[PDB]
Amino acid sequence: ATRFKKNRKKRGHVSAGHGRVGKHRKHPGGRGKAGGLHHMRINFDKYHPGYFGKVGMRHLNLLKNRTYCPTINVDKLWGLLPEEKKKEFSENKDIAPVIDVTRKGYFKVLGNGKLKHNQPIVVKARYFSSVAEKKIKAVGGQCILVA
Amino acid sequence: MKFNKQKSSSRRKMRKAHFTAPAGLRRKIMSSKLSKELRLKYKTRSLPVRKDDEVLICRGHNHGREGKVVKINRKRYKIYVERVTREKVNGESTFIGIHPSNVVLTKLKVDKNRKKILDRKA
Amino acid sequence: AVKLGAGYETSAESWGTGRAVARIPRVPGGGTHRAGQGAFGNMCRGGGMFNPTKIWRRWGRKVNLKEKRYAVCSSIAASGVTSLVLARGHRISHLKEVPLVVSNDIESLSKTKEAVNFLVSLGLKDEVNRLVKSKKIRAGKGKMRNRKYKIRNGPLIIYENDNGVKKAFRNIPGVDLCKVTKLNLLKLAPGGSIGRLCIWSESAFKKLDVIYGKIHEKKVTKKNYILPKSIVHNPDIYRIIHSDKVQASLLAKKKPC
RNA sequence: UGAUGUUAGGAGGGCAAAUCCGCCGAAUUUAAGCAUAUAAUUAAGCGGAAGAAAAGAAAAUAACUAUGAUUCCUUUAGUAACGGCGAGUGAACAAGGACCAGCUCAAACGGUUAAUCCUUCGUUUGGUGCAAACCUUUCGACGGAAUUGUCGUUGAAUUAUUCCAUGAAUGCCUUUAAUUUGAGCAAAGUGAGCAGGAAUGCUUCCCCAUAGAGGGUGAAAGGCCCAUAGUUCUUUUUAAUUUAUUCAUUGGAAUUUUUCAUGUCGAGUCGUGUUCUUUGAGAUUGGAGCACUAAUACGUGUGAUACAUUUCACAUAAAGCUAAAUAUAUGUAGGAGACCGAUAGCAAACAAGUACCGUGAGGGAAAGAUGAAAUAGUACUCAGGAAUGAGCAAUUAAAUAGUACCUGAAAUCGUUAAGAUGGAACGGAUUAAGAGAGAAAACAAGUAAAGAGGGGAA
RNA sequence: ACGGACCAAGGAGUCUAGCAAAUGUGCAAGUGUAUAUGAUUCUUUAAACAUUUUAUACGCAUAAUUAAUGUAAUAUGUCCAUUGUAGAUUUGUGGUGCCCCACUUUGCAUACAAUACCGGUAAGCAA
RNA sequence: AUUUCACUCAUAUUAAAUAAAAUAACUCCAAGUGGGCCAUUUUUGGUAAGCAGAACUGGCGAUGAGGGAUGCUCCUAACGC
RNA sequence: UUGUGUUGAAGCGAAAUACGUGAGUUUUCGUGGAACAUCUCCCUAGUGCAGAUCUUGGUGGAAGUAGCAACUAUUCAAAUGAGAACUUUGAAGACUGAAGUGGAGAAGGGUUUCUUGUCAACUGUGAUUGAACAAGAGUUAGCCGCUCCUAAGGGAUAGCU
RNA sequence: AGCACAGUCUUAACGAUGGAUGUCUUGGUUCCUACAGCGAUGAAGGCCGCAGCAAAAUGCGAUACGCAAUGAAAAUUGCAGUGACUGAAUCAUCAGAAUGCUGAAUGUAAACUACACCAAUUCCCUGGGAAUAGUGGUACUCCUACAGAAAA
Ligand SMILES: [Mg+2]
Ligand SMILES: [Mg+2]
Ligand SMILES: [Mg+2]
Ligand SMILES: [Mg+2]
Ligand SMILES: [Mg+2]
Ligand SMILES: [Mg+2]
Ligand SMILES: [Mg+2]
Ligand SMILES: [Mg+2]
Ligand SMILES: [Mg+2]
Ligand SMILES: [Mg+2]
Ligand SMILES: [Mg+2]
Ligand SMILES: [Mg+2]
Ligand SMILES: [Mg+2]
Ligand SMILES: [Mg+2]
Ligand SMILES: [Mg+2]
Ligand SMILES: [Mg+2]
Ligand SMILES: [Mg+2]
Ligand SMILES: [Mg+2]
Ligand SMILES: [Mg+2]
Ligand SMILES: [Mg+2]
Ligand SMILES: [Mg+2]
Ligand SMILES: [Mg+2]
Ligand SMILES: [Mg+2]
Ligand SMILES: [Mg+2]
Ligand SMILES: [Mg+2]
Ligand SMILES: [Mg+2]
Ligand SMILES: [Mg+2]
Ligand SMILES: [Mg+2]
Ligand SMILES: [Mg+2]
Ligand SMILES: [Mg+2]
Ligand SMILES: [Mg+2]
Ligand SMILES: [Mg+2]
Ligand SMILES: [Mg+2]
Ligand SMILES: [Mg+2]
Ligand SMILES: [Mg+2]
Ligand SMILES: [Mg+2]
Ligand SMILES: [Mg+2]
Ligand SMILES: [Mg+2]
Ligand SMILES: [Mg+2]
Ligand SMILES: [Mg+2]
Ligand SMILES: [Mg+2]
Ligand SMILES: [Mg+2]
Ligand SMILES: [Mg+2]
Ligand SMILES: [Mg+2]
Ligand SMILES: [Mg+2]
Ligand SMILES: [Mg+2]
Ligand SMILES: [Mg+2]
Ligand SMILES: [Mg+2]
Ligand SMILES: [Mg+2]
Ligand SMILES: [Mg+2]
Ligand SMILES: [Mg+2]
Ligand SMILES: [Mg+2]
Ligand SMILES: [Mg+2]
Ligand SMILES: [Mg+2]
Ligand SMILES: [Mg+2]
Ligand SMILES: [Mg+2]
Ligand SMILES: [Mg+2]
Ligand SMILES: [Mg+2]
Ligand SMILES: [Mg+2]
Ligand SMILES: [Mg+2]
Ligand SMILES: [Mg+2]
Ligand SMILES: [Mg+2]
Ligand SMILES: [Mg+2]
C-alpha cells in the first residue's frame, strides 16, 4: 500500500535519501551481470565461488522418466501401519505383515535407523540397499523383489 | 433494471433519452391522473392529456384553480389553461406554462381514438 | 486504466541549447498557437501521465481454504454473544435470547406485510425503525458514478429451503438473506465488524451440526474438516487470580518511592 | 495447329485489417569499449483470405505390464542443450484437462458393347405468398466433351441369417415442456399545521410492497408522471407423447460355411557432396542454390557423436479434403466499474481532424454553466447628434443574477480615512503610547412579594 | 560563482516479474484444492460455496554425493534414542535476608571439542 | 597424555591500585561515504610561498554562544523553556 | 457506525479574552445559494511545492518614455456635417517630364469592379474618406484566343527482367 | 462661508481588472458479451446540387431537409402557409419506386465540360399516331462453346 511506503517520510527533504555528493544516476556500474570478472570480481568470488568454467560430460537427450526413483528409510517402515494394526503384531508372535511400498509411491528402500528387536517384517520393492537388506534380515524378516 | 439485465439503470443513458425523445414518445410521457369519479366510470388510473380536456390545478402557485386546456407544447413539456395568464414587460398577455404531472383532469373529451383505448384499459 | 499512448501522439522534439529556452521537446510547425509548446513530460500541459495505469495490476488475492473456514466459524460464534451484537449497533434491548431460533413456519411466509409484522412482534420495532430513517444521499463524486444512496445493515435471515422467504423478506430496507449450505463471510462480517444479528429457522439451526461433523452424513459434511481449538481453556483470568491456591503463593504488597 | 472474331454465356481488377497466411529485411540498445553475439527470425516495405484463418488422420513416440490424427489450458522447466562457455539464449517425450471424426484420388478389377459428363429447347407433380417470388419433383430431343480414359467395385465366387431403399388408396396430425421476437396490463396520500416565490423539508394522521432499480416534476418523493416486481398474448425452432391397415416389385448391404489368388503401393523425386541462411541441435535442426543421381516392400525411412559388420523395435515419404475445443489495439450493437471531472478525461463534452500553417510529404488548436419560468430578456419619463447615464418609473424571491450573465481568490490599480518619512525597505528581543473588539473565571447563591410559562406524580 | 520580474493552477522513487531477510497468521512430516468439474450459484454474483460415490495429477520439503556406470547415513546386542566441559529448570539438607549462597539431584537451548557412519579421492591387498 | 578417588589453596574486604565497568557479547538486514583542509610539535623537495609530500594528537567540515574592532580553523566554553 | 442542511451546505473575505511546542483544529460576522461529513474501527491512491533558463494562463516597474525623418510644398474662400490641416467645389503656387504614379497585356490574385447606403472594430494623428461593413447589379464573338500540327521531352502497347 | 503642502511607503473599508475555488455534466476511458465484410447488378473516397424567405453542420439526389407503403395518430409555427373536424399535420418503421458528374473506371483524352466509330432513339393508343441530336454499345487478361479462313 502506498500508505506505508518509505518514500513518504522523505517528502520534505531535498535529496530523497540518496545524498548530495553521490547522486542517484542511472546504471553507474553497468547493466545486469555486466562487470563480473573485471570490477565486480570480489562479489562474485566471495559469494559465488565456483561460477566460471565448465566441467563434466554432455547428455544430449535426457528423458528423465528413465531414472525416477523416490526412496524410504527403514525408520518410517512401521509407521505406515495404523496404530491399532501396529498393536496386534506386538502381542501375537506367529504372524508378520507383508508391506508393498510401491503401492505408496516408493521405489527404493534405504537403510537409516533402527528396527524393533525380534519383530519380523516382509518387504516388497524394486531396489534395496545392502545395509537395509541386512537390517531386515536381522530382526527375522525377508526382502522380495518386484517389477 | 431491477432483475432483467437487458435494460439500463444508468443516469447518463436514460437522462439522455428523456431530453431527446422523439415526438411520438413525448405524448406518453405527458400523462395526467384521473379524478376519483372518473376512476369508477373507467377502470384506468391515468391517461395522456389531450387538448379539450378540463383540469384542476393541484400544485404550484396557482393551485386550486380550474379551467380548460387550450394548448399542448410537446417541445417544452407543458400545457396551457384558458384563464391562467401573465403580463410581459411590454404589457402583452401570455399563458403560464403548467407541467402535466402537477394536474388532475376532471372531464374528458372522447372520440373514436379514445374509446378504443379506454376499452382496452378496462 | 488509461489509454495506451495518451500524450505521446506528436512528432515533437527539443530545440537544444541556445535560443534562451528550456530543453523540453516542443511541437513543430506554425499558424496555430499550439506550435512551439512543450509536448510530453509529466510536468507539461497535455503531456503524459507519470506512470500510466495498467490492466496487469494485481487486482485479486488468493486465500488459504483453512483460514476462510476458520474465519467463518469464529464469525458464527460471535453472533451468539449478546454484548457483541449490541456493540455493532443493533437495537435488540427488548430481545429474549440472542441466538434467537424461530419455528419452521417462517420458511413459508409470502407477503412483505406479514414479514414486517413478524419482525415487530419479535421485539424488533426500534430495529426496523433505525433502517427506514437511515436512507440518505451520499456526499461526494460517487453520485456521478451510480452510487446514489447509503443505508445501514439490518438482520440476516438464514433458512434451509425457500418456500416464500426470499420474496417475502426482500424489499425491506437493510434486510438480507442467506442459505445454510452457502454462507458468506462478507455478509456475516460486514466491513470486517463482528456481531451480526442473525435469525435462524429450526431446520437451519439443526443442519449446523451435520455440516461440521458432529453427525456424519454423505455429501453434506465437510470432508475431513476439524473444528479449531483454543490455546486457552478458560479466559477468565481474574477468577484464577482470586483462587485460594494462587493467593496463598502471592507475596505481601510493597510500597512505592 | 496457331492465329482471328463488338460471335453466345461467364470470371479477375478497387476499398478495409484488430485477430490470420506467404515473402523481404535493419539499426538504435546490451555486453560498462568492440568486430562473433544481442536487439530479432522484430520495426518499416510487397503480396493473399475468413467469421475465424492455419494445422490435421503417422515414413509419430517409447524402450514400459506400453501409448495412438490436429489444436489449446496446467505442468515438464529457465530443465536437456547453445554461447568472445562471456553478456546472454533455450525446446521435446511421458502426466492432468477442454473437445472429440473421419475420408478421397493415384495404382489393382469391369469390353456381346463410356456404364460417364455438359449446353440449349420442351414437361410433370405438391406445398408457401395479397402480390413479387420460391421450394420440391421424374421424363424427352438435337448438339457437343470424352478411349491420349469419364463412371462403377475396393481381390473374386459360393453358403445361411438378418438389415436398407423404392408404388398405390381408405384414415392420422392431438396434448405438453423448453428456447426466441414483438406487444398489452400492472398496488398504495397529492390529508391536516410551520416556514417558503415554489414541497419532494420538519411535525402529525393514514397505507402498499413478489414493486424501497433509475429518471422526471419550481427544494431530498415506495404511495404526483414514465418505468420497476409480476403476469397474459405473440413470432422462431426442437424435444417427448398421439395410428398407421392391405397389397405389389426392383435393386443394395453386414456377418457367417466353404473355393481359389497373392496383386498394388506417388522419380531429376529421396539421398549424398559443397556453399549461404536459420534452430536449443552439438564431426549440422529445417530451408534454399549448384553438381551427382537410387531401391521395389526381404524395399525404404526414424531410434539426438563421425565409421565398418550385424540383431531388434516402430512406421509406411515424394497427391488431396475435413467440424469442435483457440484468437481478436477493426467495424456495429448491448451492459458495467473502490476510474477522470473542462490546464483532467480521446486531439476533439461546442457547425473538431474543424479554424489556421506549409509548393509538398505533413502539422494542428482555443472555446461548457442567467433564471423555476423569458409563454417573465428590461415597458415609460428626462438629458444627449449619438453611445450612454439618471429616475418620482419597471420584470423577479433576487438584477452587486442584464446575456463579456452561478460562486467570484491572488498578482496589479482607484477612492476615503489614519500614521510614518536627513543616501534602501522589511525583521528578532523587550516594553510604551494610541485605536478597534470583548464578559465563556475576570463578585453576590439564596430569601420575600407579584406576573407570564413548561413539566412529573396522586 | 550559476537559477530566480510577480501571481494562480500543474509538477518528480511508481507498476509488474523473480529472489532473499524481517515480522503477523494457519496447519505441520507434510503443505498448497493447478487447469477443470458440481451446485435448489445467478441485480449485486466477474463474488461466495463444494471436490469425483489400506484413496498413486503437479510443485516445494522429507537425503546426500559423484564427470560418470552409480552407490547411499551407529546396528540387533536394545522402543532404544554416541561421549565430555560449562550451562536454564527440577529434587533433598544447612546459612544470611519467594531471593541469594555451601553441598546434593536432573542436565533444555547453545558454545567448544571427541567419536562413529554415507558419497568422492589417495594408500595397502586384490576373483 | 588422559580417567577416577582422597586431601587442601586468601575470599565479609575481594591473591596489587582505581573505575555513572553489563551503556556487556553475538547474529541478521541495509543506508551514506571512498575530491578533504587547518593548528602546536617532529619532518622531505624547493631561494621561497596563503607551494608540494608524510607522522602523532586536537579541530574545521557537520557548530551555534562570550572575547580577539572586523574574520570557517586562535582563547573560554559546546546549546530544552 | 451515527450525523448536519431553505429556521441556509460547500466555498470565499475579515477576524478570535479560543486550543496545541508545531503541522493544524475549532468558532463569530459578511457574502453565497445546494449539498456536506464521520476521530467508532478499518481499506485504498494519479495524496502535501519557492526554486527545475520548469509547463499553461494572467499581470507589472521601465513609461506617457524610445519614437510617429526617404519620395522639393503648400495657401485663400466655399459646401456638407454633431464635429473638417489629410472628404468635395473654385482660385493660386508647384511636381511627374514620353527611360512618366501616361496607355495596353502575361504570371499571380478572385469580386477588390458598378450604383446606393453607411461607421462597432480597421484605415499606427484626425476622418463625414476607403480596396472596411450592408443591399442589389454587372462579363453577349463563324472573323480575338484556346481547341488542330509538330519540338526539346512525358505516358503507354509487344517483348524481356 | 472656511481649513488639510506635494511625492513615497504602511494598515483598514468600499470598488476596478482577472478567472482561481466549490458545486454541476446528453463527454471520455477500461473491461465483459454477441455478431461480421463491400465491389463491373459499378464499392470506399471526391465534386456539384436540392428549401418561400436558407451561410455552416445534419439529411437527401432533377421525384432532391423528402415520394409510395406499414404502425401510431392532431397538429407543425419565426412570419407566410398546409391539416380529420383518419392513405391528409407530425413521429416511427422501411421490404416498392427513384438514385446527378466521377472514381478499379473500363471507347480516345484531361490545369479541355475536347474528339471518335457502330445501331437513329423514345413514347401513346390497339396496325395506327407523336416526339427528340436525344439513347445504348465499343478497355485489358482469361475459361467453355461456336465460326469460318490459313498451316501441316
Ligand atoms: Mg537530513
Ligand atoms: Mg542533487
Ligand atoms: Mg535574456
Ligand atoms: Mg491528457
Ligand atoms: Mg468534495
Ligand atoms: Mg485489370
Ligand atoms: Mg487484390
Ligand atoms: Mg557498448
Ligand atoms: Mg554505456
Ligand atoms: Mg560506441
Ligand atoms: Mg510490418
Ligand atoms: Mg474477404
Ligand atoms: Mg481451413
Ligand atoms: Mg489443409
Ligand atoms: Mg505445454
Ligand atoms: Mg550455433
Ligand atoms: Mg533467438
Ligand atoms: Mg495428452
Ligand atoms: Mg485408374
Ligand atoms: Mg425563499
Ligand atoms: Mg430554492
Ligand atoms: Mg426520484
Ligand atoms: Mg418504485
Ligand atoms: Mg508410399
Ligand atoms: Mg541466428
Ligand atoms: Mg526416442
Ligand atoms: Mg497425406
Ligand atoms: Mg461509462
Ligand atoms: Mg481538453
Ligand atoms: Mg444555480
Ligand atoms: Mg538627497
Ligand atoms: Mg554551472
Ligand atoms: Mg537571470
Ligand atoms: Mg516468513
Ligand atoms: Mg522447480
Ligand atoms: Mg560398500
Ligand atoms: Mg578364484
Ligand atoms: Mg566523487
Ligand atoms: Mg567550534
Ligand atoms: Mg585585531
Ligand atoms: Mg470538507
Ligand atoms: Mg503527483
Ligand atoms: Mg500545487
Ligand atoms: Mg508556484
Ligand atoms: Mg512586458
Ligand atoms: Mg518623444
Ligand atoms: Mg494618413
Ligand atoms: Mg519639372
Ligand atoms: Mg526632377
Ligand atoms: Mg531622360
Ligand atoms: Mg470602388
Ligand atoms: Mg461608395
Ligand atoms: Mg487612426
Ligand atoms: Mg466586402
Ligand atoms: Mg462567347
Ligand atoms: Mg482567331
Ligand atoms: Mg519527340
Ligand atoms: Mg503629506
Ligand atoms: Mg387504406
Ligand atoms: Mg397511416
Ligand atoms: Mg448509377
Ligand atoms: Mg475514359
Ligand atoms: Mg491542351
Side-chain angles (χ1 to χ4, degrees), chain C residues 79-112:
Chain C
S79 190
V81 179
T82 294
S83 285
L84 304 179
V85 191
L86 210 71
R88 222 208 65 86
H90 291 288
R91 319 267 166 92
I92 56 155
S93 287
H94 294 280
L95 261 180
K96 291 168 189 279
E97 321 183 21
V98 71
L100 183 62
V101 182
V102 164
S103 76
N104 276 299
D105 314 333
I106 193 66
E107 269 175 352
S108 68
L109 295 178
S110 55
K111 289 198 76 68
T112 309

Coordinates of all heavy atoms in Angstrom, one line a residue, chain C residues 79-112:
Chain C
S79 N -21.8 -14.3 16.7 CA -23.2 -14.0 16.6 C -24.1 -14.4 17.8 O -25.2 -14.0 17.9 CB -23.8 -14.7 15.4 OG -25.1 -14.2 15.1
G80 N -23.5 -15.2 18.7 CA -24.2 -15.7 19.9 C -23.9 -15.0 21.2 O -24.3 -15.5 22.2
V81 N -23.2 -13.9 21.2 CA -22.9 -13.2 22.4 C -23.6 -11.9 22.4 O -23.5 -11.1 21.5 CB -21.3 -12.9 22.5 CG1 -21.0 -12.1 23.8 CG2 -20.6 -14.2 22.5
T82 N -24.5 -11.7 23.4 CA -25.4 -10.5 23.5 C -24.6 -9.2 23.4 O -25.0 -8.3 22.7 CB -26.2 -10.6 24.7 OG1 -27.1 -11.7 24.7 CG2 -27.1 -9.3 24.8
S83 N -23.5 -9.1 24.2 CA -22.8 -7.8 24.3 C -22.2 -7.4 22.9 O -22.1 -6.2 22.6 CB -21.8 -7.9 25.3 OG -22.3 -7.8 26.6
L84 N -21.7 -8.4 22.1 CA -21.1 -8.1 20.9 C -22.1 -7.6 19.9 O -21.8 -6.6 19.1 CB -20.3 -9.3 20.3 CG -19.3 -9.9 21.2 CD1 -18.7 -11.0 20.5 CD2 -18.2 -8.8 21.6
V85 N -23.3 -8.2 19.8 CA -24.3 -7.7 18.9 C -24.8 -6.3 19.2 O -25.0 -5.5 18.3 CB -25.5 -8.7 18.9 CG1 -26.4 -8.4 17.7 CG2 -25.0 -10.1 18.8
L86 N -24.9 -6.0 20.5 CA -25.2 -4.7 20.9 C -24.1 -3.7 20.5 O -24.4 -2.5 20.2 CB -25.4 -4.6 22.4 CG -26.4 -3.6 23.0 CD1 -27.8 -4.0 22.7 CD2 -26.2 -3.5 24.5
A87 N -22.9 -4.1 20.5 CA -21.8 -3.2 20.2 C -21.5 -3.0 18.7 O -20.7 -2.2 18.3 CB -20.5 -3.7 20.9
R88 N -22.3 -3.7 17.9 CA -22.3 -3.5 16.4 C -23.3 -2.5 16.0 O -23.3 -2.1 14.8 CB -22.4 -4.8 15.7 CG -21.5 -4.9 14.4 CD -22.0 -5.8 13.3 NE -23.3 -5.3 12.7 CZ -23.3 -4.4 11.7 NH1 -22.1 -4.0 11.2 NH2 -24.4 -4.0 11.3
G89 N -24.2 -2.1 16.8 CA -25.2 -1.1 16.5 C -26.6 -1.6 16.3 O -27.5 -0.9 15.8
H90 N -26.9 -2.8 16.7 CA -28.3 -3.4 16.6 C -29.1 -3.1 17.8 O -28.6 -3.2 19.0 CB -28.2 -4.9 16.3 CG -27.7 -5.3 15.0 ND1 -28.3 -5.1 13.8 CD2 -26.5 -5.8 14.7 CE1 -27.6 -5.5 12.8 NE2 -26.5 -6.0 13.3
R91 N -30.4 -2.7 17.6 CA -31.2 -2.2 18.7 C -32.1 -3.4 19.2 O -33.3 -3.6 18.9 CB -32.1 -1.1 18.2 CG -31.4 -0.1 17.4 CD -30.8 1.1 18.3 NE -29.8 1.9 17.6 CZ -30.1 3.0 17.0 NH1 -31.4 3.4 16.8 NH2 -29.1 3.7 16.4
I92 N -31.5 -4.2 20.0 CA -32.0 -5.5 20.5 C -32.2 -5.5 22.0 O -32.1 -6.6 22.6 CB -31.2 -6.7 20.0 CG1 -29.7 -6.5 20.5 CG2 -31.2 -6.8 18.5 CD1 -28.9 -7.7 20.7
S93 N -32.5 -4.4 22.6 CA -32.6 -4.3 24.0 C -33.8 -5.2 24.5 O -33.7 -5.7 25.6 CB -32.8 -2.9 24.5 OG -31.5 -2.2 24.4
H94 N -34.9 -5.3 23.7 CA -36.1 -6.0 24.1 C -36.1 -7.5 23.7 O -37.1 -8.1 24.0 CB -37.3 -5.3 23.5 CG -37.6 -3.9 24.0 ND1 -38.2 -3.7 25.2 CD2 -37.2 -2.7 23.5 CE1 -38.3 -2.4 25.4 NE2 -37.7 -1.8 24.4
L95 N -35.0 -8.0 23.1 CA -35.0 -9.4 22.7 C -34.9 -10.3 23.9 O -34.5 -9.9 25.0 CB -33.8 -9.6 21.8 CG -34.0 -9.7 20.3 CD1 -32.7 -10.0 19.6 CD2 -35.0 -10.7 19.9
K96 N -35.3 -11.5 23.7 CA -35.3 -12.5 24.8 C -33.9 -13.3 24.8 O -33.3 -13.3 25.8 CB -36.5 -13.4 24.7 CG -37.8 -12.8 25.0 CD -39.0 -13.7 24.6 CE -40.3 -12.9 24.7 NZ -40.8 -12.9 26.1
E97 N -33.6 -13.9 23.7 CA -32.3 -14.6 23.5 C -31.6 -14.2 22.3 O -32.3 -13.9 21.3 CB -32.5 -16.1 23.5 CG -33.6 -16.6 24.5 CD -33.7 -18.1 24.5 OE1 -32.7 -18.8 24.1 OE2 -34.7 -18.7 24.9
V98 N -30.3 -14.2 22.3 CA -29.6 -13.6 21.1 C -29.4 -14.7 20.0 O -29.5 -14.3 18.9 CB -28.3 -12.9 21.5 CG1 -27.2 -13.9 22.0 CG2 -27.8 -12.1 20.3
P99 N -29.2 -16.0 20.3 CA -29.2 -17.0 19.2 C -30.5 -17.0 18.5 O -30.5 -17.2 17.2 CB -28.9 -18.3 19.9 CG -28.1 -17.9 21.1 CD -28.8 -16.7 21.6
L100 N -31.7 -16.8 19.1 CA -32.9 -16.5 18.5 C -33.3 -17.4 17.4 O -33.3 -17.1 16.2 CB -32.9 -15.0 18.0 CG -34.2 -14.4 17.4 CD1 -35.2 -14.4 18.5 CD2 -33.9 -13.0 17.0
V101 N -33.7 -18.6 17.8 CA -34.3 -19.6 16.9 C -35.8 -19.4 16.7 O -36.5 -19.0 17.7 CB -33.9 -21.0 17.4 CG1 -34.4 -22.1 16.4 CG2 -32.5 -21.2 17.6
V102 N -36.3 -19.6 15.5 CA -37.7 -19.5 15.2 C -38.2 -20.8 14.6 O -37.4 -21.6 14.0 CB -37.9 -18.3 14.3 CG1 -39.3 -18.3 13.6 CG2 -37.8 -17.0 15.0
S103 N -39.5 -21.1 14.8 CA -40.1 -22.3 14.2 C -40.0 -22.2 12.7 O -39.6 -21.2 12.0 CB -41.5 -22.4 14.6 OG -42.3 -21.4 13.9
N104 N -40.3 -23.4 12.0 CA -40.2 -23.5 10.6 C -41.3 -22.9 9.8 O -41.2 -23.0 8.6 CB -40.0 -25.0 10.3 CG -38.6 -25.5 10.4 OD1 -37.7 -25.1 9.8 ND2 -38.4 -26.5 11.3
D105 N -42.3 -22.4 10.4 CA -43.3 -21.6 9.7 C -42.8 -20.4 9.0 O -43.4 -19.9 8.0 CB -44.5 -21.3 10.6 CG -45.0 -22.4 11.5 OD1 -44.8 -23.5 11.1 OD2 -45.5 -22.1 12.5
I106 N -41.6 -19.9 9.5 CA -41.0 -18.7 8.9 C -40.7 -19.0 7.4 O -40.8 -18.1 6.6 CB -39.8 -18.3 9.7 CG1 -39.3 -16.9 9.3 CG2 -38.6 -19.3 9.5 CD1 -40.2 -15.8 9.6
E107 N -40.3 -20.3 7.1 CA -39.8 -20.6 5.8 C -40.9 -20.4 4.7 O -40.5 -20.4 3.5 CB -39.3 -22.0 5.8 CG -37.8 -22.1 6.1 CD -37.2 -23.5 6.2 OE1 -38.0 -24.4 6.1 OE2 -36.0 -23.6 6.3
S108 N -42.1 -20.3 5.0 CA -43.2 -20.2 4.0 C -44.1 -19.0 4.2 O -45.3 -19.2 4.0 CB -44.0 -21.5 4.0 OG -44.7 -21.7 5.2
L109 N -43.6 -17.9 4.6 CA -44.3 -16.6 4.5 C -44.2 -16.1 3.1 O -43.2 -16.3 2.4 CB -43.8 -15.6 5.5 CG -43.9 -16.0 7.0 CD1 -43.3 -14.9 7.9 CD2 -45.4 -16.2 7.4
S110 N -45.3 -15.4 2.7 CA -45.4 -15.0 1.3 C -45.6 -13.5 1.1 O -45.5 -13.1 -0.1 CB -46.6 -15.7 0.7 OG -47.8 -15.5 1.4
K111 N -45.9 -12.7 2.1 CA -46.2 -11.3 1.9 C -45.3 -10.4 2.8 O -45.0 -10.8 3.9 CB -47.6 -10.9 2.1 CG -48.5 -11.5 1.1 CD -49.9 -10.9 1.1 CE -49.8 -9.5 0.4 NZ -49.6 -9.5 -1.0
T112 N -44.8 -9.2 2.2 CA -43.9 -8.4 2.9 C -44.5 -7.8 4.2 O -43.8 -7.6 5.2 CB -43.5 -7.2 2.0 OG1 -43.0 -7.7 0.8 CG2 -42.4 -6.4 2.7

